[PDB]
Amino acid sequence: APAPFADFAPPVRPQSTLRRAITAAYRRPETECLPPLVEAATQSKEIRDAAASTARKLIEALRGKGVEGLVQEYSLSSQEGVALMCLAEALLRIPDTATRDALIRDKIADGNWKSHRSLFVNAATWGLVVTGKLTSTVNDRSLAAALTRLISRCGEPVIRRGVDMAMRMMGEQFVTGETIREALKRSKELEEKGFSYSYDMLGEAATTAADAERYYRDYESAIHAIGKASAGRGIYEGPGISIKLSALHPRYSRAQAARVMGELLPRVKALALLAKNYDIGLNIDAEEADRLELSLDLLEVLCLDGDLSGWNGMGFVVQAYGKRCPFVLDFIIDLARRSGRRIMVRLVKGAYWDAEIKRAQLDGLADFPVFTRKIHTDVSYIACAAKLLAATDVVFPQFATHNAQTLAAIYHMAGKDFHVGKYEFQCLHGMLDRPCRIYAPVGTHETLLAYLVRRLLENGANSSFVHRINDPKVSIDELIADPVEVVRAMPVVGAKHDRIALPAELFGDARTNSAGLDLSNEETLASLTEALRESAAMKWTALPQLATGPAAGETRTVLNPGDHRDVVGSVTETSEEDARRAVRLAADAAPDWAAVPPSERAACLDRAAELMQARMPTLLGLIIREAGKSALNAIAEVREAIDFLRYYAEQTRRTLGPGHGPLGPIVCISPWNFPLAIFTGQIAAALVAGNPVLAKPAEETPLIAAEGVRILREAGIPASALQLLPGDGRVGAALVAAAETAGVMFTGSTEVARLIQAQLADRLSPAGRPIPLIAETGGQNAMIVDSSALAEQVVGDVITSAFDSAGQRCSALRVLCLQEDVADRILTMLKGALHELHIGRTDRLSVDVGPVITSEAKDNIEKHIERMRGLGRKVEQIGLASETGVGTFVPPTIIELEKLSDLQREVFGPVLHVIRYRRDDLDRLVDDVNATGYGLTFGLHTRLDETIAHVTSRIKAGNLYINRNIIGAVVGVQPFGGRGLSGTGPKAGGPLYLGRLVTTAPVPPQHSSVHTDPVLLDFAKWLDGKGARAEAEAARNAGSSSALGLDLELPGPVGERNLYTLHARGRILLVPATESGLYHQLAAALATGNSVAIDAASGLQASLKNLPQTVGLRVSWSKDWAADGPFAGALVEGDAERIRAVNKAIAALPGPLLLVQAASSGEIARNPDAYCLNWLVEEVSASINTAAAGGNASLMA
């Protein structure tokens, strides 16, 4: 077998001194980066005065010199203007110019535009054009009303003017031309006036091999057309081309560096050879920060390649908003000297700022790779311009900026001696005597959208020059302010922006965010390689760790699921006798652990979090080898464990006091698929709530569990409070059945949860109440995609959601639902993206999908696939390398289904099912998704507000995701947990969790609602009318205490809105004994928005005579509980023997595990909280990607 991690992430080439200086600057503090840039950008008083004069002259000229004319002419509102341009866009899709005009005159202008994909799919873009503001989603009902109104008011003439305006903008303003031939023809004019051109064919972010081939042949054909037109003018006076490397390979990333050098580089070389033959410029555009250093490896190989010698047209963009910018320039200038090629360097400020802030926050990295104050980028730009102007003999500087102040400072910096070829300026199409190159987009209306939104966002940001030059409140004096001197006079030079949170500070004072690792950073990969190798040399063990000490037992090895030859460690498993002994020991330790004050227990959790953060690299290595995870997923799992510890610590400090007594010994049974995070989360919550814990890890992953217990014990948790019992489900069953077990936390399959519930149904606590079970189980998770979604975004989110971790996430996408009109195109792209995944042993950074956990899991998954294939369903699978034979692998698989009912149970593997639906059947489809009985995660890709409102109001799932993937819920941000067959609740990583692990629940932070259920109020009035005054008052009190209607936004990363809401659970089974008991149960259920089914065997029908219709609509009587489900909960009244018998009957009900609450008649009389309203509402988490339209509205401020 190959040595573990011997080939984890070797760099493409040895890192030179100059390359290492780039990497070292990646994320340094802004206060460190700025002072040297200030020093380099300083110019003399005489030059600064001359620059301000020149900048003033430029600005006065710009202010002394379209859609707004149309809006003014027809007195359109904003929404009418947007709707009119969406209509014109649609009308221009009709090719035959006479056919379009007939549709306008005879059909459209007569109002019936609806009868002739939403019209408003691209309205966010036209919103930007009309209003200057970006909205993430489209209010399509508002736009439809506006379009009806404006046509009914103004008729054919306004439509004609709209069409002619959209024609001019999309064919002449957004682009230089629709095809390279058209763009070249239109360039003759300004070329005669001294301008030059760089053409951009508008490809980026290839998803499939076919996409990358299409962009390649677009670039190749453009080079021919440009070179033919250039006709020997050369690289300075003649036109050139700009390319994006992300267009040329579907896996352009550091993780796939070997494929990039082997497959992408030859393509760039072939394009460069063609540009050399015509002697035109070929420029590599700069993209995301994590592609910068990868692109340098391509630049270096190309500049050293003798086949390209004799040609100085190779160009490369560097972004001044980047902290590495000066060091990148030092590297390029030295490469120019070594190679003897005069590299064309386009200096830009940077186009991806919002995305870089969001990415660094999501990844929990030390700092940003870009500046956070706009004035810092301006100083960086000027400093880097001074560096470039000092090297014009070896590089050709190209100053790409529209900012008149930046231009004037550089113009005077460059001095009086100028010749064509020394340097040039550049500008974007559609926005002194020095040459000026126009960056010219070329493409059809369809292909233009991503670039166009990015462009229009920059122009609309309050800090941007284009927005300020057009703002009449901004004086010229403000516009010509020297950024260098403004920064130099600041109190702390280079301070971070006050309103942008470092990743560590996302949650402010609540808790410290967990820190991740940058797998694009070569220093990180080099140190992580050594730590991973060292972790594979360790002799990992898992032992039964009882309060008294380690116990003996049957010992066996733990094998790497990706290669059974790799022994990871050894586990000693627990005998059923020792399991029962551990519970007795935990029972005897319970009072001492309960007596540790809650603040000290929380301090132990924070200490364990610090220890896990420090040990992350070693922990990664164990998770990769024991559980078959990739390094990316292992990082996220360790972060989740750290977040659980810190989140439950903070929730404890906010809530727990002397009256919230522990339950007693808690049995925590955890799954193999998150063998550290869910393991840690369950144990941490139970411990910090004051309960001693019996930890039973999954049989497949005991080593990381044992290491998590060692860390918790090292942090201060006493051995009597946390005992580790490795073994199989028989150990789990022995623990559950133990007499002193006071509660069970289970995460695993629904079937096993059902077996645990059955065992607990016979049981009562010493107080005669049911034993609490928190059971978080499977999901049959769906995603619905409509024809307004962006295919490229969808495919990326689908590939991640279905096949990350080999589909072994509870949240994994199982069923993709595609609107019929776009299904073929998305399926084609999805299959193409499937075939770009690398499957193998996960100790290589290049591996995307690892093994499934066992051969039994493999056999079960492959049996499902073959059944589908035998039924004739289309099955797409990628081929597995022969190396996978030594482990247990299932290839990522796509299966096309006819109906949603083709699926029986959850298939816990990398198997995506695809169904198609007609748009008018969307509501029926949501019904069919709900009808599986599951309710865990759900995704929706759409830009249309009406569709969002419809789907999110009708779907029944615990975790909703809009325009993003459906995996990787973040503790305290997307509290995680479903309903129905997916779980009992409360949600892990949410504010109701700890209250389930104490005998009296505390009031969670922010847990309240000003809304009162109206049926509850109707019931309390009815009670008053019947004379039941005490119960009527109790009902009103329940109405006020209920938190139904709570609606919160949770702190998190920029570019995302994370919502948390409390809803009704559904239909609650009521099993009353007395009339007053029934009234209290009904009040509790109605106050939390639920309907009820009342046990008809109680004989209390006469107690509810003549109910108001509003209350009767919610009440049903049940003689056969199993026939009237599924229920979402149960309330029971009776003595201990009655509660036990009812609990057994409820456990036998088919379907979901019901959260049961029981009370005696006397407790109902004595205790207004006899039934806890916290457990009668349902938590829903919704995470909305608000950057999905292409940028961040809030960050534009």
Ligand X SMILES: NC(=O)c1ccc[n+]([C@@H]2O[C@H](COP(=O)([O-])OP(=O)(O)OC[C@H]3O[C@@H](n4cnc5c(N)ncnc54)[C@H](O)[C@@H]3O)[C@@H](O)[C@H]2O)c1
Ligand Y SMILES: Cc1cc2c(cc1C)N([C@H]1CN[C@H](C(=O)O)S1)c1c([nH]c(=O)[nH]c1=O)N2C[C@H](O)[C@H](O)[C@H](O)COP(=O)(O)OP(=O)(O)OC[C@H]1O[C@@H](n2cnc3c(N)ncnc32)[C@H](O)[C@@H]1O
Residue 1056 Cβ, how far from a second copy at the closest point, in Å?
Answer: 16
**Would the annotation count 122 as a binding residue?**
no
| Residue 748 annotated in ligand binding | yes
Nearest distance, CB of residue 265 and ligand Y, angstroms: 19
How far is the C-alpha of 1135 from the C-alpha of 1160, rounded, in Å? 6
Q: Is 88 annotated as a binding residue?
A: no
Pair 901, 929: CB distance under 8 Å = no
Token digits for 809? 């996430």
Nearer CB in complex with ligand Y: 369/697: 369
Cross-strand partners of 256: none
C-alpha–C-alpha distance, residues 655 and 1174, integer Å: 15
Which residues inside 488-507 make contact with ligand X, applying CB under 6 A?
none
Is 749 annotated as ligand-binding? yes
Q: Which does 777 bind (CB under 5 to 8 A by kind): ligand Y, a second copy, ligand X, none?
A: ligand X
Candidates 776, 836, 896, 1178; catalytic one: 776
Closer CB to a second copy, 77 or 860, in the complex:
77
Q: C-beta of 691: minimal distance to ligand X in Å?
A: 18
Q: Which does 696 bind (CB under 5 to 8 A by kind): ligand X, a second copy, ligand Y, none?
A: ligand X
Q: Which of 640, 810, 1133, 1179 is catalytic?
A: 810
Is 906 assigned to a binding site?
Answer: yes
1142 backbone dihedrals φ, ψ, rounded to 5°: -65, -40
CB of 54 or CB of 959, closer to ligand X: 959
The answer on whether 391 is annotated among ligand-binding residues is no
Q: Is 376 among the residues that bind ligand Y (CB under 6 A)?
A: yes
Tell me which DSSP letter residue 529 carries.
H
Q: Is 319 in the site for ligand Y (CB under 6 A)?
A: yes
458 annotated as a binding-site residue = yes
Q: Which residues contact 332 (CB under 8 A, 6 or more apart)?
A: 299, 316, 318, 343, 345, 395
846, HSE (Cβ side, Cα atoms, 13 Å): 16
Least Cβ distance, residue 507 to a second copy (angstroms): 31
The distance of closest approach from Cβ of residue 1012 to a second copy in the complex, given in angstroms and rounded to an integer, is: 5
The annotation status of 349 as a binding-site residue, yes or no, is yes
Q: Does 350 bind ligand Y (CB under 6 A)?
A: yes
> How far apart are the C-alpha atoms of 624 and 94, rounded to whole Å?
54
**Which of ligand Y, a second copy, ligand X, none interacts with 317 (beta carbon under 5 to 8 A by kind)?**
ligand Y
Query: In whole angstroms, how large is the CA radius of gyration of the chain?
Result: 33
Distances (CA, A) of 1081 to 203, 1036, 1069: 62, 13, 10
**CB of 657: closest distance to a second copy in angstroms?**
4
**Is the Cα torsion angle 888, 889, 895, 900 positive or negative in sign?**
positive
Could you write out the DSSP letters of every residue in 889-903? Answer: ----EEEE-SSGGG-
DSSP β-ladder status, 549-550 and 343-348: unpaired
Residues followed by a break in the chain, C–N over 2.5 Å? 65, 116, 431
Binding region for ligand Y (CB under 6 A) out of 51-59, 396-404, 850-858, 1027-1035: 396-404
Retrieve residue 502's tokens.
């470092």
Stretch that binds ligand Y, among 424-432, 544-552, 1110-1118, 1132-1140 (CB under 6 A): 424-432
From the list ligand Y, ligand X, a second copy, none, pick the one residue 145 interacts with, judged by a Cβ distance below 5 to 8 Å according to partner type: a second copy
Which lies closer to a second copy via its Cβ, residue 29 or residue 661?
661
User: What does 1006 interact with, of ligand X, ligand Y, a second copy, none (CB < 5 to 8 A by kind)?
Assistant: a second copy
Answer for which of 122, 246, 312, 426 binds ligand Y (CB under 6 A) is 426
Is 602 flagged in the annotation as binding? no
Residue 37 CA to residue 325 CA, distance in Å, equals: 10
Q: For residue 257, report the phi and psi dihedrals to the nearest 5 degrees.
A: -60, -40
Q: Assess contact for 368 and 335: CB atoms under 8 A.
A: no
Q: Which does 1112 bind (CB under 5 to 8 A by kind): ligand X, ligand Y, a second copy, none?
A: none
Residue 455 marked ligand-binding: yes
934 binds, among ligand Y, ligand X, a second copy, none (CB under 5 to 8 A by kind): none
Tell me the residue nearest to ligand X as measured from the CB.
732
Spatial neighbors of 881 by CB under 8 A, at least 6 apart, are 839, 840
Footprint of ligand X on 704-763 (CB under 6 A): 728-729, 732-733, 736, 747-749, 752, 755-756
Please return the burial class of 167, using the count of CB atoms within 10 Å of its CB with bins 0-12, 13-18 and 19+.
middle
- CB 6, min distance to ligand Y, A: 37
Query: b/e per residue, 1150-1184, with b = 16+ CB within 10 A?
Result: eebbbbbbbbbbebbeeeeebbebbbbbbbbbbbb
CA gap 704, 676 in Å, rounded: 6
Distant-in-sequence contacts of 264-267, Cβ < 8 A, 24+ apart: 264/298, 265/298, 265/301, 265/302, 267/212, 267/216
The answer to whether 465 is a known ligand-binding residue is yes
Q: Is 892 near ligand X (CB under 6 A)?
A: no
- In this structure, which amino acid lies at residue 1072? P
Residue 30 annotated in ligand binding? no
Q: Does the annotation mark 1031 as catalytic?
A: no
Q: Is 439 in the site for ligand Y (CB under 6 A)?
A: yes
* Closest separation in Å from C-beta 724 to ligand X: 12
**Alpha-carbon gap, residue 406 to 54, rounded angstroms:** 11
1190 among annotated binding-site residues? no
Q: Which does 557 bind (CB under 5 to 8 A by kind): ligand Y, ligand X, a second copy, none?
A: none
Binding map of ligand X across residues 925-964, x = CB under 6 A, - = no contact? -----------x----------------------------
Question: Considering the rule CB under 6 A, would residue 672 count as an interface residue with ligand X?
Answer: yes
Give which of a second copy, ligand X, ligand Y, none residue 464 binds (C-beta under 5 to 8 Å, depending on kind). ligand Y
**Should residue 908 be labelled a site residue for ligand X when binding is judged by CB under 6 A?**
yes
CA distances from 1040 to 992, 1005, 1017, 1068, 1083 (A): 18, 17, 10, 20, 11
Beta pairing class for 773-776 and 743-747: parallel
Whether the CB-CB separation of 373 and 498 falls below 8 Å is answered with no
Nearer to ligand Y by Cβ, of 252 and 746: the residue is: 252
# residues near ligand X by CB under 6 A: 30
111 contact choice in ligand Y, a second copy, ligand X, none (CB below 5 to 8 Å, kind-dependent): a second copy
Q: Which does 994 bind (CB under 5 to 8 A by kind): ligand X, a second copy, ligand Y, none?
A: a second copy
Of positions 176, 403, 787, 805, contacts ligand Y by CB under 6 A: 403
323 marked among binding-site residues? no
The residue type found at 576 is E
CA distance 1188 to 1197: 18
Of 450-458, 588-596, 599-607, 698-706, the window that binds ligand Y (rule: CB under 6 A) is 450-458
Q: How far is the CB of 1054 from a second copy (least distance, A)?
A: 18
Alpha carbons 231 and 237: distance in angstroms, whole number: 11
Pick 585 or 645: Cβ nearer a second copy? 645
In the residue annotation, 810 being an active-site residue is answered as yes
Distance, CA of 248 to CA of 218 (rounded, Å): 11
Enumerate residues 452-511 that contact ligand Y by CB under 6 A: 454, 458, 463-465, 497
Residue spans of alpha helices (H) in 292-421:
292-304, 325-339, 353-363, 374-389, 404-413
Q: How many CB atoms lie within 10 A of CB 826?
A: 23
Catalytic annotation, residues:
776, 810
Binding residues for Mg(2+): 1147, 1149
Binding residues for NAD(+): 670, 672-673, 696, 699, 748-749, 776-777, 906
Residues making contact with ligand Y (CB under 6 A):
285-286, 317, 319, 321, 348-353, 371-374, 376-377, 400-403, 406, 426-428, 439, 451, 454, 458, 463-465, 497
Binding residues for NADH: 670, 672-673, 696, 699, 748-749, 776, 906
